Paper text:
Indeed, we found that Mlp37, the closest homolog of Mlp24, serves as a chemoreceptor for taurine as well as serine, arginine and other amino acids. We determined the crystal structures of the ligand-binding domain of Mlp37 in complex with l-serine and taurine to reveal the molecular mechanism enabling Mlp37 to accommodate these structurally distinct ligands, l-serine and taurine. The ligand complex structures and the mutational analyses demonstrate that only one of the two potential ligand-binding pockets (the membrane-distal pocket I) is involved in ligand binding by Mlp37.
The titration curves of purified Mlp37p (10 μM) with taurine show direct binding with a dissociation constant (Kd) of 3.2 μM, calculated by assuming that an Mlp37p monomer binds one taurine molecule. Taurine and l-serine are bound only in pocket I in the crystal structures. The amino group of taurine lies at the equivalent position of that of l-serine and interacts with Tyr-170, Asp-201 and Asp-172. The remaining oxygen of the sulfonate is located near the hydroxyl oxygen of l-serine, and it interacts with the indole NH of Trp-147 and a water molecule bound to Asp-172, the indole NH of Trp-141, and the main-chain amino group of Ala-174. These structural features are essentially the same in the two subunits of the dimeric Mlp37p taurine complex.
Residue numbers in the entry:
A (entry chain A), B (entry chain B): 53 to 296
Write the structure that this text describes.
Amino acid sequence: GPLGSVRDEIRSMVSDSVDEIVDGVSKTTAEVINGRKSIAQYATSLIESNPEPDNVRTIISQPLIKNTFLLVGFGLEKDGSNINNDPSWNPGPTWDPRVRPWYKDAKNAGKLVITAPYADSASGEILVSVATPVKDSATGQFLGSIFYDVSLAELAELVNEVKLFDAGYVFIVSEDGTTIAHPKKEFNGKPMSEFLGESKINVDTHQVIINGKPYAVSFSDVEGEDWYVGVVIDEEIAYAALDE
Amino acid sequence: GPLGSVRDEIRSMVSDSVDEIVDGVSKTTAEVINGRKSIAQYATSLIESNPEPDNVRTIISQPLIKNTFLLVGFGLEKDGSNINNDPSWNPGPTWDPRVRPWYKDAKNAGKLVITAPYADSASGEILVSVATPVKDSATGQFLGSIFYDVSLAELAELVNEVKLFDAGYVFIVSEDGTTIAHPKKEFNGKPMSEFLGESKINVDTHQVIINGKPYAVSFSDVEGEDWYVGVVIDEEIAYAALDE
């Protein structure tokens, strides 16, 4: 039969509970992301002060860096050489950093950016990178760019700390609805409509039907990036968890 | 019956509820602290790699360091000289880092430590410092210690993000009861018995005589230091909110 009698009050408590999850995780996410950008910028400044390869290796090979990012690499405009923090890393024999998304985004913007999701050269896996240009301290000339890789699997884990008891999940999308981080990596870098049905962001908690079932969906902006933290919650389970 | 039992329940809930607040904050807090410790270790490793004063200044004068810590200074064992990140800082005409607690604590521990509260030489204010020793990379000899100053006021501000709807406040203490951080800086460095009445730490929630009056008080350990986060809330106002 149908879902039966449902308190117009309890389903506003759910509506607000959802708003609260997204708003809070979005603050949390902005802080963690800001933290990692700050570490990237510091390393980059140290490198600019003296970009000798041995100095670069020292700066990027410390535990803090190796623990904060998947991989770090500084590509040179001059010859497409690179200095990186993982001797096991092989992006391929003819790889030129100068053509890559992290490199071009940092060059094009002349400042620190985080890339849209893109396919890793070595593994093909989708990730993002913090990326920064490196300028000649004397002349201001562009010398190359540095990437700092960020695991989307790990971002997904981070935003799903919140305890939802299989009632729903948290994810991250960009302003245009491209998925930044989903519990199912298969969606990373794809339109959020692939799992939500809807393609456009509507921040206010609202009902969405997915395979015939009602879900409460809400979003909240992330300060510092054109990103939103989103949540999708089985409305029936949510209502039921509460009712009781 | 309906009164005794109901009251016992609300009191058991108000207990738990309060234990919860500080269990959370003791996790948030360790997160922040471990973050600041990792930055200090990072900068120290880079300094040990090349402790020439110009390189030291470059490392400790970047915005990440300037925004993470109140002040940073490397005190030298050879002559008591120092390299610091604020040319306007002046600890006085007869200051020697080698008799200061941050310096000795790091020299003795032979690794990274945080100090107990102490009085800042320049300003008199009560603070703590992350402190690290510096070794000559060629001979292993002790070269000096570095301090990275932590604002206790700002720490109080942090633990008090928590919305207590003005019914109480959060604070930090060390094992022996010494106040690490209190919303009123006058208590920093003092026995907690001064604002609680209680001189000894009891983690599980409980009632406390202060102005011959009842507030709820719980402690949760902080992972990584011999510290505890603590809370005090109005039991009357507490009870009322869990009751309704």
